[PDB]
Amino acid sequence: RTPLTAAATLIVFCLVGYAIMQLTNEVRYDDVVAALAATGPSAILLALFFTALSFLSLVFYDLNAIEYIGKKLPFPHVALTAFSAYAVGNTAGFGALSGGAIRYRAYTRLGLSPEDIGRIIAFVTLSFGLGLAAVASIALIIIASEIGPLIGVSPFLLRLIAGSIIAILGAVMIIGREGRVLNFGAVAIRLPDSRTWSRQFLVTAFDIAASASVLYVLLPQTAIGWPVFLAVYAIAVGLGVLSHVPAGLGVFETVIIASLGSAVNIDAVLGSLVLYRLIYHVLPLLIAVLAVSAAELHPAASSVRRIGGRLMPQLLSTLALLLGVMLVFSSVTPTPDQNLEFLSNYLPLPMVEGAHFLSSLLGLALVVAARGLGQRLDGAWWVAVFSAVAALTLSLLKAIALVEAAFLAFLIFGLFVSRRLFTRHASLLNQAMTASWLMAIAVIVVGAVVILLFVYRDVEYSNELWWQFEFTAEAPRGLRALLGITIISSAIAIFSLLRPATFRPEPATEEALTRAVEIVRKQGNADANLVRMGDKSIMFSEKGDAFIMYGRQGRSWIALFDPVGDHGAVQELVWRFVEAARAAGCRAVFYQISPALLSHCADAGLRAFKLGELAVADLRTFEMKGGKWANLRQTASRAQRDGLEFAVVEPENVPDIIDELAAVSTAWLEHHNAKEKGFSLGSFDPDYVSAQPVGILKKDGKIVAFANILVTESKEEGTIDLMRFSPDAPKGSMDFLFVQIMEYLRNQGFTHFNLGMAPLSAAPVWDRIGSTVFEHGERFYNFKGLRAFKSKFHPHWQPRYLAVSGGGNPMIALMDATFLIGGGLKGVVR
Amino acid sequence: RTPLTAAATLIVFCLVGYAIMQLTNEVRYDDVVAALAATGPSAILLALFFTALSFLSLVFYDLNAIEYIGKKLPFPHVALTAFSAYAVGNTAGFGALSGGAIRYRAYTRLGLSPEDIGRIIAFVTLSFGLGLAAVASIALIIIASEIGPLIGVSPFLLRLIAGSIIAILGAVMIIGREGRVLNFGAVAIRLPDSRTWSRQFLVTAFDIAASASVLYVLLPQTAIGWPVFLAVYAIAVGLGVLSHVPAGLGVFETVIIASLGSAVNIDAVLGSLVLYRLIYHVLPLLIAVLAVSAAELHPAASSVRRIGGRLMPQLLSTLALLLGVMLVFSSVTPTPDQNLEFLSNYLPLPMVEGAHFLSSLLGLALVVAARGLGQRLDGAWWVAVFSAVAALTLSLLKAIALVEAAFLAFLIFGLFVSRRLFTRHASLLNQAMTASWLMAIAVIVVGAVVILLFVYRDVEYSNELWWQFEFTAEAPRGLRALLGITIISSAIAIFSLLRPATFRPEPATEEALTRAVEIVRKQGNADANLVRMGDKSIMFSEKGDAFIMYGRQGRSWIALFDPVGDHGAVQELVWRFVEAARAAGCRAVFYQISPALLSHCADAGLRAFKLGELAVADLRTFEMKGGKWANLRQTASRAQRDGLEFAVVEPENVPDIIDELAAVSTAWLEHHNAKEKGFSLGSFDPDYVSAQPVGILKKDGKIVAFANILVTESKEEGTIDLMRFSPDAPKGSMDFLFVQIMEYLRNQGFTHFNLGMAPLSAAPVWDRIGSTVFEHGERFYNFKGLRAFKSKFHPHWQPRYLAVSGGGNPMIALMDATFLIGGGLKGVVR
Ligand SMILES: CCCCCCCC/C=C/CCCCCCCC(=O)O[C@H](COC(=O)CCCCCCCCCCCCCCC)COP(=O)(O)OC[C@H](O)COC(=O)[C@@H](N)CCCCN
Ligand SMILES: CCCCCCCC/C=C/CCCCCCCC(=O)O[C@H](COC(=O)CCCCCCCCCCCCCCC)COP(=O)(O)OC[C@H](O)COC(=O)[C@@H](N)CCCCN
Ligand SMILES: CCCCCCCC/C=C/CCCCCCCC(=O)O[C@H](COC(=O)CCCCCCCCCCCCCCC)COP(=O)(O)OC[C@@H](O)CO
Ligand SMILES: CCCCCCCC/C=C/CCCCCCCC(=O)O[C@H](COC(=O)CCCCCCCCCCCCCCC)COP(=O)(O)OC[C@@H](O)CO
């Protein structure tokens, strides 16, 4: 579960913290600084070059995935999207700052379908996963004789564990030949063709080589050699990824330091590690921001503008989070003694103490503003701008910190250039925090503790340090800043955990229900009539000419069947639902949304998973006397041979047949050995059945079947909700009932008839959802005819999606939806 | 040219001989023997394993090529063919012992078309070529810092030359994207898709790794390391391939010894090199032979049998050539002193001297028998069997050489098991020798000189050595054997160069011409009537009911349009032509053969290149009054509007219109500004025109066009040879002439009409032929209508091929064919 996973990552981070403090026992901060200064222009330029090559390779990851799904897209646009996904992903990788999240947001604007985008994401991660495994294992079998003495392991046992991984990968590839599906439980993996996976391997290998080469050109030494370096680099990168620490922050450095810490000077390895994290992590993100900001300030400009407007908040969230990390770490790190005596000869002592504490606290403020910046909040924007401008001013006062001032100025440039993208008036503090963002805050605080304990390893701790206030008392100043961020972070965690949610949402007021029904009547969507059940909460647009109907179940808010009413109010209502859901500490879920609402949902930060398809029949060319629908015609005659009669009972006369309808309804319930549903399906509640016309089927002067008919005043679409038959209803009864309802609808002048949802009839490279959605579709979408039955009317198949807010697991949202339908709230009952 | 290339390879071999004798200045044969004995079972077993892996990889080369051409073939059969191609190819690679030659012979039986097989061969060689380049260059850029000090070159300049090759390969790949054709003169290269070339790269890389690993596990050392070893191995393998020495015999060992000869003991490197050549070269060939022989002695047995019966002579040619090399080298190598004193205590001195000299000479006899074994000669078989049985007996007498006896026994097993495959009674000595086989003999003799000079480096040369005869005088014995093989080899070269050819072949005797024409009349092929021209030599089958007609031009014998007559005599005649062509010192060429003769031609050792297609019209459903041929019908009416008249003049009345035909013929010649042709095309010779019926076209009571009609008594097919029009012949004249000839043929009861050759309307990965054939087709196949004109009659397009014996260049055969047609012999003229 989400909290258990995060706590495991934190335990791993704290152990690798113990390790790195042990491994760097005889290294001091000044050695590391001297090492950073020793690095030549040549080494830096080569590192920039290899960073560039890595990022070109990664673009090819995404182009390959698009060729595999067979959906050509423009290179400028793919390139920008992939660059943005890997910048953000390599630096962070927790919810909404993942590569997957960047890919879903960018590619929805480029017009890939949610399953397209889901398959792309499965391709790119499995590629990286099996590729990294392969590269590592192959390298380790080749250089076991060289890496063994380095790490103090038998070159025989390495060659065994290396070779064993090679065997298992080989076995997977051979068992998964010709798209055979390998099931590791709920996970179903189908690998691609040998040719696809061969080109991808070469790109994964190029990229891993280029990145390793970045770190290699930065480390001065002649004792390891690129092949051994590549193996250790690959294993470090893989272990970091498995650890689930953001960027593999300690895991990567610990694997590199342990591995190379016999051959190489650990101060030089640490210097190289600092620059590696600057050049490979911090720089491509700065560049992405600068590019998009310059665009918004040429065909190039145009391309960058359209993708960046979409991605700029996630880039700026990641930039804010990095500059927060920077401010916190700089708080626990020593300032040059040159700068302090300059500050000694001008400013007074109390200011340079204040400026320090405050800059530490503004870093934590920037990491909170980062989560907000992701949600495009205006408050988050203001907080972030104030924080950055104050930290710019303050950092020069506390250490003449020109490079920190420069980075903060880049952030203020980007924030001012794209102010328009942050218009959402949801509260930043009220929103709460997720386990992932508490874990990132926790690694930042433990990072700071490790950094202080490394930096001031020599200083002897006294209770006097806490109240020591001198122009050159950096250890005291640092200890105090750390206390600061610790207490404020503990506060944030405590608040997120104890957050109130004002119980559950309110039910459907009598006045409220009427207002929604009137909106339903003068718009096109017939299934919107399900608000009449009164089992769903209603929240209106500000002007009152649109609404969302929704349910409450555990930690999900689940909306039903798109926003309803005036098309102009949809954008606002989608955003308002997701924010209010967030405010109550619940994930937002839209159940069975159309392709028209996918774009608006993607902005709000929701991922859409195809549930099934509606069968919609064009009534304006539904020609029964035509050869195409001859059997539909034939079975009406068969119904006439069985002496079946059809009538539409208008609402005020429904009371006269309620008793007869009630008997048929329960006869059906026990015949199918089933209970009533809710939410997406109506249940036999007299007042609900009484509110709409009923199509009834009669044999020997007795009602044998019925269906409540859902219509609007616009005549754009009709549908049915309940449709039930007595056990004795003759064969063809549905054929007869459906054919007569559609002809009645056809002649009164309705344009379309909705036969309702049918489950799925292309598979991601790796999937955990397919099985889950399939077991749900059959459970709910087969009550009023099978897919084959609906196909006989030659309908348009439009897909419908489950859009879910939290990125944890699509399945958890559908399980809350399953109870809302299966059990759920009782609601209004007569 | 063929001789210049071979002489360049020999100069390279002699220089690398100087080098290897220099590099091994302080190494003695006993050190190398001690090294071979030091090798453990573990190292040998690992080497066998890596040999197995290499050979599995190479099978995937051929499967990949078949997928690229889109022609699925059974894995057992492909696997056996690829194994056989690489065994033979790695060991030899000169004409008929190349991988290409093994592929053309095996895949023709499996039913791939000659262009299929041509594209496969282009795929596999370019794959190996660019792959080896890539592997080498990539390895060299990665380990330049490690290989530099080893070879005494700047790791900077290596990284420059390595990187420059990488750049050029990269540039080729990028310019050749999307099947763009890159022309390096006559050579047109179109690379495959990124995905194909990516999977192939991974196989080439696996194979090169596995082979390198064979040599690596055999060399005892801890000072180089597998990556540096791989780079040096790849460069050695590439240089050997470029040198064109068989197996890269000295080039590979010299590159390996120079490279590793600072770090590794050269005696141990040389021991490792000996075993490498045993395990990677000699063993897979032994195994192939054993497998096929056991097959001919189960579904496995069946598969092996069908492919081996086809390939067994080329395997056994390669085995004989290796055992010849063995006997020669063993002659110049020392025998154990243990064995000689055993021979001292029993046999007398004169026998063990004789046995030595004779075994040397029988090795050279086996290398001559190898060329014969390739041609499936019975004489070659007998010679090879006698040689092997004598050398078995003799080797035990001269050195108790049990392992040599064993290898010779494998050869005698294989020869006896497949005696049936060697039935051709062509003379082995009369056949002569090619430049390639003289070059192989020359490297074998220089190999022997280098080996003797290395083995007896210490011995001080005297004229007394020549006549020293002692049980322990091995250096004398060796010197004498070397003199032996030198004089006998010089004799063979001298004979091959001075070989007589009894001038040129005889022309068509009056009696001979009649006998052929009578054969033509009672068979189906109408174009066989071209023998009547009397410009072509005729050679009959033994029973006299079939014949081949052919021409003589420079160093080619060119047959015309398949063997003619009784189907049963074709196999014998194809073989007889190729042998007699060989006897006269000329390449055999069949010009425009049908698919039915490709199999028989493939056995004889000819490679077929598609020239073009015949347009053959089914006259039994040629319905002019049908809607499908409405315009053909319309233009006959247009001809009637132009007042055109048609008649077939029977042969005895042709003299009455000769003068009128002669005027039309020359009027046509100058109008098209052209001269008469020969060989495949008739020319206006009165006696030739008089021998067959003439279709004539008349306007205003005057002949304006004519065509001689070629028929047989069987009514299976008709065609035309000359078809000529006066400059004033009205538009549609051909349409009219062709339509009337076919209707006349249709009603008299002929089943097919041959419209004649049309040039080509899928490209090898690399080709040198395409341009050449295209310039020839347009030059000769457009005299009696364009391709588009022939398509109007809706014909069957059957391809026709140029099958050429010598593997040097297809183009050289077509140039001799071009003169035979363009100029050629005058022939019989009236
Ligand atoms: C004595 C004992 C000896 C010890 C020695 C043993 C050696 C063992 C060797 C270990 C190698 C392990 C490799 C495992 C790889 C896991 C990766 C994976 O599953 O896919 C990643 C991460 O996926 C996960 O979430 C991990 C799930 C764990 C289950 C799988 C474990 C088995 C190994 C096979 C993997 C199969 C595929 C996984 C299923 C999806 C997803 O990729 P992302 O898009 O997240 O991309 C990653 C980042 O964008 C890049 O990474 C970074 O953070 C960058 N800093 C990297 C820098 C370079 C960028 N060019
Ligand atoms: C100071 C100076 C520093 C010096 C250092 C410089 C380093 C330079 C590096 C050199 C690498 C050169 C690589 C060139 C490769 C040429 C190969 C080629 O063209 O294709 C081979 C041979 O093709 C030829 O006939 C050679 C023609 C030369 C022109 C091309 C030269 C440019 C290089 C690019 C090549 C492009 C492709 C060539 C055009 C067709 C054909 O393959 P085969 O089927 O004959 O297969 C070969 C054998 O079956 C295997 O080889 C053996 O004999 C075995 N013993 C090998 C053992 C392992 C088997 N698994
Ligand atoms: C949850 C998300 C985490 C993602 C993190 C992943 C990536 C890791 C990068 C971190 C922050 C990058 C942004 C910062 C970039 C700016 C870097 C820069 O310019 O250097 C200094 C920044 O302050 C600083 O010393 C800050 C130093 C930042 C670099 C440290 C990288 C750490 C990795 C090394 C291995 C140890 C592992 C740590 C765990 C034990 C300024 O110098 P200046 O002249 O003004 O005066 C000296 C100074 O002491 C004044 O206070
Ligand atoms: C044109 C075509 C050329 C293709 C050639 C490419 C491949 C190269 C293999 C050659 C022949 C392979 C067949 C021979 C396999 C049999 C090998 C074997 O069993 O060993 C001995 C064979 O005799 C021998 O010493 C013969 C030795 C054969 C192995 C030598 C390989 C040479 C390569 C090493 C580097 C130098 C480069 C040479 C150029 C300077 C028998 O021992 P035995 O107990 O009976 O008593 C010792 C003896 O002195 C009795 O006379």
Token pair for residue B196?
A: 């194909």
> CB of B360 within 8 A of CB of B331?
yes
List the beta bridge partners of residue B649: B694
Nearest ligand, CA A447: 3
List the beta bridge partners of residue B648: B695
> CB of B433 within 8 A of CB of B496?
yes
Query: What's the B97 CA to ligand 4 centre distance in angstroms?
Result: 20
The span from the CA of A457 to the CA of B353, in Å, is: 86
> Using a 6 Å cutoff on CB, does residue B89 contact ligand 2?
yes
Query: What's the A479 CA to ligand 3 centre distance in angstroms?
Result: 18
Best probe residue, ligand 2, of B206, B241, B768 (max atoms within 8 Å of C-beta): B241
The three-point CA angle A137-A52-B202 to 5° equals 35
CA distances to A322, A327, B156 from A356, in Å: 18, 10, 49
> Which residue of chain B comes nearest to A139, CA vs CA?
B227
> Using a 6 Å cutoff on CB, does residue B237 contact ligand 2?
yes
Nearest ligand, CA A452: 3
The span from the CA of A419 to the CA of A405, in Å, is: 21
Nearest to B752 by CA among B653, B587, B647, B621: B621
The span from the CA of A665 to the CA of A705, in Å, is: 9
> CB of B39 within 8 A of CB of B271?
yes
**DSSP symbols for B46-84:** HHHHHHHHHHHHHHHHHHHHHHHHT----HHHHHHHHHH
In angstroms, what separates the C-alpha of A407 from chain B's closest C-alpha? Answer: 36
- The minimal CB distance from A195 to the residues B146, B199, B226 is found for B199
> CB of B742 within 8 A of CB of B751?
no
List the beta strands (DSSP E) in A135-217: 182-183, 188-189
> CB of B48 within 8 A of CB of B279?
yes
Contacts of B199 in chain A (CB under 8 A): 194-195, 198-199
Nearest ligand, CA B270: 4
* Element of type H or E holding A138: helix A114-142
Which residue do the tokens 């620490």 mark? A245
Domain assignment of residue A179, yes or no: no
Nearest to B140 by CA among B230, B55, B65: B230
The span from the CA of B705 to the CA of B707, in Å, is: 7
The span from the CA of A447 to the CA of A469, in Å, is: 25
Nearest to B559 by CA among B606, B523, B512, B519: B606
> CB of A607 within 8 A of CB of A104?
yes
The span from the CA of B796 to the CA of B790, in Å, is: 10
**DSSP symbols for B160-198:** HHHHHHHHHHHHHHHHTGGGPPEESSS-EE----HHHHH
List the beta bridge partners of residue B724: B706
The span from the CA of B371 to the CA of B379, in Å, is: 11
The span from the CA of A272 to the CA of A313, in Å, is: 31
* Element of type H or E holding B39: none
Nearest to B86 by CA among B113, B61, B69: B61
The span from the CA of B287 to the CA of A211, in Å, is: 46
- The minimal CB distance from A199 to the residues B142, B195, B222 is found for B195
Token pair for residue B236?
A: 């050695």
> CB of B696 within 8 A of CB of B706?
yes
The span from the CA of B140 to the CA of B232, in Å, is: 8
Which residue do the tokens 């030899």 mark? B92
> B199 vs A202: CB contact, 8 Å cut-off?
no
CA distances to A557, A723, A783, B681, B767 from A793, in Å: 35, 17, 17, 68, 58
Best probe residue, ligand 3, of A30, A214, A249, A321 (max atoms within 8 Å of C-beta): A249
List the beta bridge partners of residue B375: none
Q: Whose CA is nearest to atom 52 of ligand 2?
A: B90
> Using a 6 Å cutoff on CB, does residue A247 contact ligand 1?
yes
Encode burial over B737-773: b for 16+ CB neighbours within 10 A, e otherwise: bbbbbbebbbeeebebbbbbbbbbeeebbbbbbbebb
* Residues in Cβ contact with B340 at an 8 Å cutoff, skipping those fewer than 6 apart: B352, B399, B471, B472, B474
A159 in helix, strand or coil?
helix
Interface test with A, best of B199, B216, B217 (most A CBs within 10 A): B199
> B226 vs A199: CB contact, 8 Å cut-off?
no
A65 in helix, strand or coil?
helix
CA distances to B435, B583, B819 from B586, in Å: 13, 8, 16
- The minimal CB distance from A202 to the residues B196, B201, B227 is found for B201
Q: Whose CA is nearest to atom 43 of ligand 2?
A: B125
Phi-psi region of B432 (alpha: psi -120 to 50; beta: other; left: phi over 0): left
> Using a 6 Å cutoff on CB, does residue B440 contact ligand 4?
yes
The span from the CA of A85 to the CA of A100, in Å, is: 7
Domain assignment of residue A420, yes or no: yes
Query: What's the B275 CA to ligand 4 centre distance in angstroms?
Result: 9
Token pair for residue A665?
A: 């309804």
> Using a 6 Å cutoff on CB, does residue A7 contact ligand 3?
no
Contacts of B227 in chain A (CB under 8 A): 142-143, 227
* Residues in Cβ contact with B590 at an 8 Å cutoff, skipping those fewer than 6 apart: B558, B559, B562, B574, B577, B597, B601, B606, B801, B802, B803
> CB of A59 within 8 A of CB of A83?
yes
A interface with B, Cβ–Cβ below 8 Å: 142-143, 145-146, 194-196, 198-199, 201-202, 222, 225-227
List the beta strands (DSSP E) in A429-540: 537-540
* Residue B627 CB-half CA count within 13 A: 0
> Using a 6 Å cutoff on CB, does residue A241 contact ligand 1?
yes
Which residue do the tokens 């090795």 mark? B363
List the beta bridge partners of residue B547: B540, B564
* Residue A423 CB-half CA count within 13 A: 9
Helices vs. strands in chain B: H and E counts, helices first? 30, 15
Residue type, B318: T
Contacts of A195 in chain B (CB under 8 A): 195-196, 198-199
List the beta bridge partners of residue B264: none
- The minimal CB distance from B195 to the residues A196, A225, A226 is found for A196
> CB of B25 within 8 A of CB of B330?
no
Nearest to A753 by CA among A578, A583, A545, A527: A527
CA distances to A18, A147, A243, A257, B556 from A254, in Å: 10, 16, 12, 5, 74
List the beta bridge partners of residue A647: A696
Phi-psi region of B427 (alpha: psi -120 to 50; beta: other; left: phi over 0): beta
Q: How many CB atoms lie within 10 A of CB B29?
A: 17
> CB of B619 within 8 A of CB of B745?
yes
* Residues in Cβ contact with A421 at an 8 Å cutoff, skipping those fewer than 6 apart: A309, A312, A313, A376
User: Per 3-state DSSP, what percentage of chain B is helix, strand, and coil (rounded to 5)?
Assistant: 65, 10, 25
In angstroms, what separates the C-alpha of A67 from chain B's closest C-alpha? Answer: 11
Helix axes B75-91, B283-296, angle to 10 degrees: 130
Nearest to A226 by CA among B230, B222, B143, B226: B143
> A199 vs B194: CB contact, 8 Å cut-off?
yes
The span from the CA of A351 to the CA of B752, in Å, is: 108
Nearest to A291 by CA among A56, A104, A96, A84: A84
φ, ψ for residue B744, nearest 5 deg? -55, -50
The span from the CA of B180 to the CA of B193, in Å, is: 11
In angstroms, what separates the C-alpha of B201 from chain A's closest C-alpha? Answer: 9
Query: What's the B239 CA to ligand 2 centre distance in angstroms?
Result: 7
> CB of B394 within 8 A of CB of B355?
yes
Q: Structural domain tally of chain A? A: 1
List the beta bridge partners of residue A699: A644, A702
B225 in helix, strand or coil?
coil
> CB of A564 within 8 A of CB of A588?
no
Longest dimension (CA), chain B: 108
Nearest ligand, CA A768: 1
* Element of type H or E holding A71: none
In angstroms, what separates the C-alpha of B263 from chain A's closest C-alpha? Answer: 17
* Residues in Cβ contact with B642 at an 8 Å cutoff, skipping those fewer than 6 apart: B699, B730, B732
A434 in helix, strand or coil?
coil
φ, ψ for residue B314, nearest 5 deg? -75, -40
Token pair for residue A216?
A: 């290699």
Query: What's the B20 CA to ligand 1 centre distance in angstroms?
Result: 49
> B198 vs A199: CB contact, 8 Å cut-off?
yes
- Provide the H-helix boundaries in B642-769: 658-671, 686-690, 733-748
> A226 vs B143: CB contact, 8 Å cut-off?
yes
* Residues in Cβ contact with A811 at an 8 Å cutoff, skipping those fewer than 6 apart: A768, A769, A772
> Using a 6 Å cutoff on CB, does residue B94 contact ligand 2?
no
> Which residue of chain B comes nearest to A68, CA vs CA?
B195
Q: How many CB atoms lie within 10 A of CB A592?
A: 21
Q: Whose CA is nearest to atom 36 of ligand 2?
A: B129
Token pair for residue B98?
A: 């190349």
* Residue B59 CB-half CA count within 13 A: 15
> Using a 6 Å cutoff on CB, does residue B211 contact ligand 2?
yes
Q: How many CB atoms lie within 10 A of CB A824?
A: 20
In angstroms, what separates the C-alpha of B68 from chain A's closest C-alpha? Answer: 11
Q: How many CB atoms lie within 10 A of CB A167?
A: 11
The three-point CA angle A158-A162-A166 to 5° equals 165
**Radius of gyration of chain A from its Cα atoms, rounded to whole angstroms:** 32
The span from the CA of A432 to the CA of A375, in Å, is: 12
> Using a 6 Å cutoff on CB, does residue B339 contact ligand 4?
no
The number of residues making up chain B comes to 830
The three-point CA angle B354-B359-B362 to 5° equals 125
Query: What's the A53 CA to ligand 3 centre distance in angstroms?
Result: 24
The span from the CA of A765 to the CA of B676, in Å, is: 68
The span from the CA of A809 to the CA of A165, in Å, is: 29
- Provide the H-helix boundaries in A219-248: 226-243
Q: How many CB atoms lie within 10 A of CB A263?
A: 15
CA distances to A704, A765, A766 from A191, in Å: 52, 6, 8
> CB of A589 within 8 A of CB of A813?
yes
Helix axes A226-243, A194-218, angle to 10 degrees: 110
**DSSP symbols for A306-346:** HHHHHHHHHHHHHHHHHHHHHHHHHHHSPPPHHHHHHHHHS
Nearest to B774 by CA among B159, B264, B188, B237: B188
The span from the CA of B362 to the CA of B365, in Å, is: 5
**Radius of gyration of chain B from its Cα atoms, rounded to whole angstroms:** 32
- The minimal CB distance from B146 to the residues A198, A202, A225 is found for A225
* Residues in Cβ contact with B462 at an 8 Å cutoff, skipping those fewer than 6 apart: none
* Residues in Cβ contact with B621 at an 8 Å cutoff, skipping those fewer than 6 apart: none
> B202 vs A199: CB contact, 8 Å cut-off?
no
> Using a 6 Å cutoff on CB, does residue A243 contact ligand 1?
no
Query: What's the B779 CA to ligand 3 centre distance in angstroms?
Result: 76
Please tell me what resolution, in angstroms, this structure has: 3.0
Domain assignment of residue A568, yes or no: no
Contacts of A194 in chain B (CB under 8 A): 199
The span from the CA of A634 to the CA of A631, in Å, is: 5
Domain assignment of residue A354, yes or no: yes
CA distances to B371, B384, B586 from B432, in Å: 10, 17, 10
Residue type, B474: E
Query: What's the A572 CA to ligand 4 centre distance in angstroms?
Result: 86
> Using a 6 Å cutoff on CB, does residue A260 contact ligand 1?
no
Interface test with A, best of B49, B50, B138, B194 (most A CBs within 10 A): B194
* Residues in Cβ contact with B773 at an 8 Å cutoff, skipping those fewer than 6 apart: B609, B610, B611, B612, B759, B760, B802, B814
User: Domain of A419?
Assistant: 343-499
The span from the CA of B372 to the CA of B351, in Å, is: 30
Domain assignment of residue A380, yes or no: yes
